[PDB]
Every structure is written in C-alpha cells, then in structure tokens.
Design a binder for this molecule. Structure first.
Ligand SMILES: [Ca+2]
Ligand SMILES: [Ca+2]
Ligand SMILES: [Ca+2]
Ligand SMILES: [Ca+2]
Lengths: 360, 363, 362, 363
C-alpha cells in the first residue's frame, strides 16, 4: 500500500530549510521518503528569477548531507519544482510530498508520481518535441503513482525551461530558429506546450488536434488539471502527477475544480467541496490549495477592462498571481497557498485549474 | 430646496477619457452644472510619479468648462476632482460622478444619500504630516458635513480626501528656505499626508479626542484611526479636497450609503457587512450596487493572519500597489465586478493592515 | 526665405508650459511660427505612458489660447512628438522648432531647415507592416519638400512619432476579423518603430524597396536608416514626421550634423556627431542647442562581447535601460544630461546602435 | 614580510556561475588556498529583495569548500565574500578574485598593490546606521590596514565593505523587543547601513575627526565623507566585511591601485584621473586595467549640474538602480568595457551625488 504525507512549510527566505529540518529532526519526515518539493519562492517569477535555483540548491545541499549522497543524486531522486513570484499577500512556503510503503487498511486516497523528461535544445521549446516528450513523461508519472484512470488525476504540476537572450543567440549561431525571440514570451510557449503534453497524455485532447501552430494560439485546447511553471534553472521538464487511487492508505485526498476567471471564488469553493471540505468549519483540514492564474487575452474580466496586458512596469503573470492568491486567501482565510501564473492551455483563457489537498 | 444626489459609476478607456460622462450629459441624465465631485481610479502607478491623476482632472475640467461656458479655473474651484491612481490586478479604471440636484420635491422617508464638499487652504511642504494639516482637514470636514446637511457624525459613512505629497524638488526647496519636512523621502511623504488627513477626519467626527493627537503620534500610534476616512495623495494638488458621503433626513436621493471596516486585506466578511449596511442582503440584490469604495494597505507587521508576505520588502513594486491589487481582487470576488474603488495606504484609516469600506446602493 | 530657431526648454512636469510661455511673453518666440515640439516626458516611455499625451494636451491648450484658435487646429498645424522615458540622469525638456519667413538673403552654404508632415491614421492591424512603411515614406518626402531639402544627403535626422497596440485595440482588430502583427503591446512598439524607420530609409534611398517586406520588418537588421529616430505612443493613431537637415535656401544661424553610434557606449560617435555639426573642441560645446539620439539593447545580449541583462530583465523593460545608458554616455561627453535620447532603435542604425544628431549654433 | 597580490576579473553567466574561477584553478593560475576575497557584481536588483547576492556567496563557498577539503563554514570565516547586487544598463556580471600569498622577494621599486581583510561582529538591527556600527567598522578597517601592511592612510585607495540591512520582519522583531531602529523603512535602512559604514572608514583613516560624527550626522551631514569608502548592503549578512585595497612598500605585486573621486554621476574626468593615478596615461595603456571600482548615487538635490532628473521621484525604479546604470555607462564609455564594478548608494562616500572610483592596473 502507498501512503502519501504532505507538509506545507512556511519559509523565511528562498534558502530557508529550517522548517523542513525541524520535521526531519523530530522524526515526522524520513528524508529518504521525500519524492517531491513544490515551492513558492519570493523572486519575481519571470525570466530573471534566481530564487528558484537558490531554493533548489539549498534544499539539495541540505538533503544530500542528511542522506549521505551527492547533490546530483538528490536532484535525480526528488522533484524540485520552484514556482517564483509571491506577489500581493502570497506567503512563501514549500510543500513536501512524502511517500511511504505500509501494508495496512478504503476508497481512493492521495497518490503521487514523478517523472523527468530529457533536456531540450532551445529550438525545441514550445513545439511538438516538448509536447510529445512531456506526454510520455506524464504517463510515466501516472504509473509511478499507480493511477490507471486518467479521471483520477486531479493535478499535474510541471517545471519547464525558458529562453534567455544567451540561449537564443547561441541557437542563432548554430543556425536554428527558436519558437519566439522574446525571453518572457518563451515562458508562455514552454508552459503551454508542456500543458498540452499533459492534455495529450491524459486523453483530454486527441493528438490530431495538436500542432506547432496551435501552441499558444487555440485556447479551446486546454487541460483541466495541468499546472506548468517555467524557470531558467533547468533544461528539461519535471513532472508531478497527483491524484487518488484505490491502492492507497493515505489519510489525505485531493479534489479540484477550474476557475472560470481570476475572481471565480465559486470554483475555489467547488474545489474545497470536491476534496471533502463542505463548510467553513472544515477549513482547517486544508493541507494546501494549488491553482493556476493568468491574465485573459481579451484584456477584461467579466466585461471590465484591466491593465495587466498594457502595464509595461509589472508583467502580467505577477499581477495574475496576486489576484488569484487574494481570491483564494479570502475564501480559506490563509494566503499561504500555491498560485502559479501563466495558464496557457490550463483551464480556459483567463482561468486555471485549482486543486485542494485536505485531511480526511 | 431639497437635495437629491445621483451617483454614476462610469468605465474609462484611459485617464483622459471623458466619453462616458459626455454620453450621460448628452442624453440629459446629468446636468453638468449640478456635478459636485468626481472620484476617479486612474491607471498610473498611484505613487509619486503618477501623472494620470492630473491628466484626468485636466481633461475633465477642460470638458466641463467648455460644456458650461466657464473657465477651467472656475470648474476646479467648484467641483472636487479626486483622482486615485493605481489600477493594479484586475481593478478597472473608472470615475464616480456625484451629482447634486436642488429639487422642489419632498424628502424621502428616512435617511438617504447626501454629499458635501470642502477644500482646505494650500499647505506649505513643511506642514504635511503635521498638526497644521490635521487641524485644517478637521475644519474642512465639518464644513463639508454642513454642506451635506448631515449634523450627526454617525450618519457619515465615507470621507474621501485628496491630499498633497513631497517631491524631491519641494523637499530641496524647503531645505533652501531653512525648513525641515516631516520626512526626507517622496514615497513616505504620501503616508504622512494620508495619515494626518485621516486623523483630521477622526478629529472632526469625534472618533478620537484632540488630546490624543500630536505630531509624534502621526504615522506612529495605529490605535488612533477613523472608521470612515479614505485618503489619497498626489503631486497634482497643494491642498486637501474633501468629499463627505453619508445619509440625511433632508435628502430625496434614491440611494443610501453603508460601510464597515476591513480588519485586514483578506476580510471578505467586512465586504459583506458593508453591503448589508447599505441594504444589500443577498447576492441577488447586488445589482443595486452603485460602487464599492475601500482602503487597502500592507500591515506594518509584514504579515497577514500570521503569514509572511513581501509587500514591505519588495524593492521592485511599492506596497500600496500590491495592497490595491489584493483588496480589489477580494472585493471583486464577493461582488462579481472588479470595477470598484480601491485606494492604497490606510494610515489611521481602519486598523493597521485594514481600512474602511463603503457601499453606495440603490434603495 | 526660411529661418529656423530652436529652443531647448527644461520642464518641471509633463504639463509644464511655463518655460515656453516665458519665451513667448519675452518676445523671443512668436507662437504662430512654431512648427514642431519634440519632448522628453517623464513617464515610463513604454505602453502605459500617459505623460506623452498629457504634455501634448497641455501644449495644445496653451498655444490654442495664445493664438485664439481651437486645440484641434493647433494639432493639425504643429507636430507634437513626445518621447517618454527620462531614466537615469536624463532631464525632461522640450525642444521647440520655430520657422520664420525672412527677406534676408541665403547664408553662404547650408543652414538648418525643418519640415513637417503627417500620415493618415492607421488601423491596428496595419502597424508593423508595409502599409505603415509606405505611408511613412510618402510623408517623409512631403516633409523634405516642406523643408526645402532636395538632396537626401542633407537630411541629418528624421524624428517620428508612431502608434502602438493596446489589448483593447487588439480586441477591436479581432472583432473586425483582423490579425495584428504581434499580440504583445510592448513588442508592438518595436514593430511600429521599425516599420516607420524603414519608411524613412525607403524615402531617403538608404534601402531599395525590393529588399523590404513584412517578413523583414524587425528581423533583417542589415536594413536600416542612418538618420531615422522613431518613437511610439498610445496618444496618437498616425505617424508624425519632422525632417531636420540643412538647405541652401535657409537663413538659419544653426546647422545640424550627425553620426551613428555603433553601440550603446560609442562615445566616439558622439564626438563625431559634434564635429559634423561644427563643434571641433570641448570649448565649443557651448554652441550645442540639443543632441538627439537613438539607443537600444542589442539582440545579441552583449556589448563588445560583454553580457548584460537588458533583454532578460523582467522588472525593467529594455528600452528604459538603453535610454539611461546612452543619455549617460552623451551627458559625459557634452557635460549636460538635458539631451534627447529615445529607446528602441529597430532599423535605426545597426543592431544595438542608433543615429545621433547635433543641432549647433554656427 | 613580502606579500604578492594577484587579481582576476572573471565574467559570470549567472549568480551561481563558478566556471571561470574553476578554469583558473584547474590550470594552476590560482591556488584556491590563497584566495582572500571575492568582490562580485550579481544580477539581482541590488536592493532589499536581492537573493542573487546570497546565491552567489553560497555557490562560491560550496565550490571552494570542496576544492579545499574544508567546510563551507570555515571558507566563510576565511574568505571575504562581498556580493554587490544590481547589474543595470550594460553593466556586465562578474567577480573579482583577490589572491594573496607571502613570497620570498626583494624590495619592489616603489609601492605595489596590497590587500587586507577584516570582519566585524554581527550587529543588532537597532545598531545599524548608528555609532555602534561606525565605531566597530572603524576598528575593523584599522585591522584590515594592518593585514594589508599599510600604515599610512594616504596609501589606502579603496575600502570595500558589505554591510547589513533591515527587513520588515527584523523591524517587527526589534519592535517586539522594545527597540527602535534608525528608520522604519527597509530600503532606506540600506542607506543608513552604507553611510554609517562609510563614516567608519573615514574615522579609521583620519579623513574625519571623531568629534564631528554622531547619530544625528549620519545620512544628514553630507560635508562628512570618505574619499575611498565603497559600501554595499545585503540581506545575506548581519555583520560588516571589509576589504582594504592600497599600495605598500612590502608588496611584490605586479599591480598597483589608484583612485579619484567622481564629483557627480557624469564626471568622466574623474574616471581618467583614476586611470592616470593607476599609471594608465593614454588610451593605448588601457589594456592594463584589471578592474575599475566605483560608487554611484542620486544627489539629494534631485539634479545633476543644475538639471533635474527623476531618480528620487520614480516610484517604479529605485534610485540606486538608476545611479548604477548611469555611472557604469560613463565608465564603460571611457574604458571601452562595461564589465566594471559599480555600486549604488554613496552616503558619506565622496560628495553628495558623487563617489570614489579606483582602478587596479598592471604595472
Ligand atoms: Ca488558462
Ligand atoms: Ca489602516
Ligand atoms: Ca539600431
Ligand atoms: Ca556620495
């Protein structure tokens, strides 16, 4: 039997491992059983965010020394997905996923799987090469989680690469053309291609509907559970599949809904209910809320104009994260929840998936 | 005669967009001679170097001057123009136009919306954030209450103020004249102007006694605050402009105002309390909203309900910008509409980390 | 006979008309003879910069009341080109171009001449495409005639204001069944600037028409003008053109010269521009009326092989950084940060560089 | 006691890039045991929430610990790590590595490059920007002068310091402990830490007499400044780290250091004067530059040579970011290379609006 435990840990800085160390030193976490850490780090969440790599380096160092292995082996063994940007009231934190085998005694309970893709050349980001390799890795992660029914996947969290000026120019020197000649926009193509990879692997969209031309163009194509995030600190995709399976002894469950837009508090309440939280009094059973946020391509929300796509000072994914975190925070009474910005092919245009991990 | 207040919340396409107001004037719904105040959300950064505020006022004053056949200077002496910059997150730029009609009709039964306007003298740079600004604002708030025909401060539900700030040029001029300003920082000067102005509201309304207010308490003693003050700072003016909004027995308005106080930036309960205080008791009655007006800020503790955030540590985005995005998103999620008024920096306006929130609603 | 006088006026804010009013009230400027005003306004110089429109509105309202005509007529008569972004030490200011008819003879040789022309408004789906290139080229030739300049070699600076795309305008284009050149408001500024600059190069013979296509715009950096200076704004829907050069039929006591900065730190090009304008030593720097230059981040992400972060910085857009850098370089050569520097130099000088002109007293 | 200093300016591809240093170590050009200090330009925002500084130090400490077979803790006690954030404009990220070893050499002709290092104790938040930091820094500067074998302060040409700052959480902790900090503003706290640290340099070197320094003068009396101090603040440390750079008769280095003082942000003449003071007398000798190190800042007057700028009014971009872009561009245009060290915020470092500038050059 598979047992998943999940710990939401406040952090004081990107390199703060003290909260995790406390759980390890007390015996609550066996570090050998950590399979994934999903972080909100307090950089800008865009191209030049180095808090993501700083956080991964610090955690890999700490765990490597606790486990007596190399940092390189830790990163091959544990998924480190650091989502930058803690705008508004969003509280920096890490979510640690622990998976234990115990033979013990109902229904379906939380299950997790992890998979990594190969490194991508710069000219492969945002194109079918990334779509198809991610799709394979998602199936790989589903099996690792022992989930056979794609309907039982409630959240697929991915970290994916981006283009820097340096990588674009290197591609230029090698005679290769990149999907887009813009560092910030490259994040959208990488996020969206990865998300279409989830939809492809999960059967949400048929392969004949996906092409290079549809990536970041056909917003009718999206996954209802995909959550993708981009960073300078890696060259491949890291996959975490989270769902429920009948062969689990976890005392946790995951549910989800889809925010129709950035202010869709109803979808937050629907996600809570799908995870078994039916009243405000049961709010303390939340382990974490995980959601995608984005600026709608129309430049409006419910017929009302906003400046997210016109604001040259603050990039739109920063604003979307602040908004959606505030909406969730106002429903659950806690701003320490995971919100990642840029939801290309993840929920509808201007919306995004939202999942809740809760105590049973 | 009898006062009837009508309020129009008008979407804008840019700071200088007067088209929505012009449509209401051209259709006969607004007599421009009866406009008494315009409260705007303009899409600049809402901080020191926000010129969308002055651009919006200039555009409105030009337009109204030409419609009325008077000079822009006379319009500005007659009509309050309070432009609150910063439309972060999903917050929708718009203006709220306050029209006051004299009508030979009976007052409505009970108390209905009433509005009053008053302007203070200009302040010297060295007076911002100090008792001179507190006491002059308090005097003007009482004048605006009289203008609104509100004698009981308990019937005042929102006092909206525009106040000045310090630029580097004004600080340096003060230094040459041998004067010390309250703070040698342009962005922080907004907080002192906002806070002194808010304490002036609290003093005028009896929310705080005069003996508790001193220069040393301004922007320091957060136990002192008004539950209805809403203050906003700008480079585009040198005085304080005051709009008092409340209810009066001597009003024929088909509108009312209610309010509550957000205890913190994510206090959706306070939004629902303000709606209820304005007579909106269910989600179906939210179509009676004319506007929601709220103050937002980063708490001095650097936390919300024990959870850290970076608003006070973020050197890229100033904290009033972040607070506005948050509180607008919270309100928008309750009412289903991000076109509501949210202003940042709530010194002495509600508790530390919170702020007053009012609702103007149709009866 | 034409005489051009040029006044560089410090401003205290985008709406500050006091310095211009002082020159009018002192008798130094007849407002009826103003033909163009080129401003540096202290907004962010990107998409959501409303200081540009605030400055034009304030200047048009002031001049309309001084002249006893409508604001609409002022805007039809006078070019208002407000370049946002005053980063670093760059000092906000306006440069006012006055053109007088004089009976004096022709000054021996060539002296400053200015011409102005406007294009029609463009639909959003036209920005960054050949329609903008070709309409700009037509207007540049008209402005050359207005300036009485027949030889393109005597054109030393072609300053343009051009439109941009906002989310709402993109949505309008979509609603009308049209696709825009790019679905990014900030990037739309580059396409508008670049198409406009290629229009200058076409009109002046710097590039042949058969080399220009929609695909080349903002892609083939071998195609550029050595005198074009283009600037984009939400506050207008057309292109406004100011051609500045020298003409034999000018009685101006000023001349214009120029060079091309090869990169953002090319102080040699600043000195070369000064020398081309007759300023041969540091002591003659007092003859400067203004220096006008284009600045940009190179697509390579480097300057002389050294990496910089301008194209990777998600907090500060690259045209803001380039303006701060090039203004500082010029300021250090001429001893004055109140010079005109505009960012985003697509097809204006080489990739990573831009034209630089000097207006100087003879 | 003859000492030889070698200095290596190394381009970096990211804050954590150690590859250039590893190349010099692997080729035998640098014995890692002889590294005494690393001075970095890291590509974060250079303000409060810049974590590239700590990322760079952590990466360098890890790498050196593994190369030397010691713990990271010992590396940090052994090697000064001063990471100056902010690579605005064309400023190129890089590190400058200082190697120092004893050598059996004869007396050099004249004086040659010398370096000394010293660390202060950790400071309480309430000690930053006050005499406790001034006096402790002065003590450490004198210690570093001894480490460098420089007895005459006129032979000190650059004193580079990393110092702490205040975050919201540290301010709130101080408040909970009943303590008042020098300023209740995270960004402004950097200026007080930088300025107090610079005054400590001036005190140690005899540039200013002790009786002129008090808490009230810190960040207020701009007549008081050091001509060689260069201070930089960061969240990643709680003490001050000091690198003294000068020339000594007891040096066998093939390098020298010279300096001047930029009177304002566009003072290219001072750049050429610093080059000349380092023995570089013509453009043809420019290839002898190892690095140029300079301080930059926005003048409190809000102007440069009487011309207004917006650095102190700009609520979007903090003034130290703008000053760094400007001064780096000025230097780059003189020397033809933007990979030079420029640090922003020059409180008590050169005049108001200016700052020291040093050149390390091959003989
Ligand atoms: Ca989506
Ligand atoms: Ca408050
Ligand atoms: Ca160019
Ligand atoms: Ca200084």
């Amino acid at each position: 039997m598979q047992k998943v435990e999940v710990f939401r840990i406040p952090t004081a800085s990107p390199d703060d491992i003290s909260g995790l160390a406390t759980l390890i030193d007390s015996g609550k976490i066996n570090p050998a059983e950590i399979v994934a850490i999903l972080g909100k780090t307090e950089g800008n969440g865009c191209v030049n965010d180095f808090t993501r790599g700083f956080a991964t380096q610090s955690l890999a160092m700490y765990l490597a020394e606790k486990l007596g292995i190399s940092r390189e082996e830790v990163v091959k063994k544990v998924a480190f997905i650091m989502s930058g940007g803690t705008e508004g009231v969003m509280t920096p934190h890490i979510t640690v996923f622990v998976r234990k085998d115990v033979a013990a005694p109902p229904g379906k309970r939380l299950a997790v799987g992890v998979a990594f893709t190969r490194d991508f050349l710069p000219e492969e980001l945002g194109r079918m090469e990334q779509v198809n390799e991610v799709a394979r890795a998602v199936k790989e992660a589903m099996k690792d989680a022992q989930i056979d029914d794609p309907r039982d996947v409630h959240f697929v969290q991915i970290k994916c690469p981006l283009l820097t000026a340096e990588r674009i120019e290197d591609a230029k020197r090698r005679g290769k053309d990149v999907v887009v000649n813009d560092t910030y926009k490259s994040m959208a193509y990488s996020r969206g291609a990865s998300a279409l990879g989830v939809a492809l692997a999960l059967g949400e969209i048929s392969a004949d509907k996906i092409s290079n031309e549809a990536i970041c163009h056909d917003w009718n194509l999206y996954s209802s559970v995909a959550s993708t995030s981009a960073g300078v600190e890696l060259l491949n995709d890291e996959i975490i599949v989270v769902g429920n399976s009948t062969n689990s002894a976890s005392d946790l469950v995951i549910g989800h809904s889809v925010m129709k837009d950035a202010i869709d508090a109803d979808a937050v309440r629907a996600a809570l209910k799908d995870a078994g939280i039916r009243s405000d009094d049961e709010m303390d059973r939340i382990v974490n809320v995980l959601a995608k946020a984005e600026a709608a391509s129309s430049g409006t929300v419910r017929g009302r104009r906003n400046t997210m796509l016109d604001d040259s000072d603050i990039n739109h994914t920063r604003s979307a994260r602040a908004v959606v975190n505030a909406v969730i925070a106002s429903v659950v009474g806690d701003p320490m929840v995971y919100v990642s910005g840029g939801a290309e092919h993840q929920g509808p245009d201007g919306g995004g998936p939202i999942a809740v991990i809760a105590r049973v």
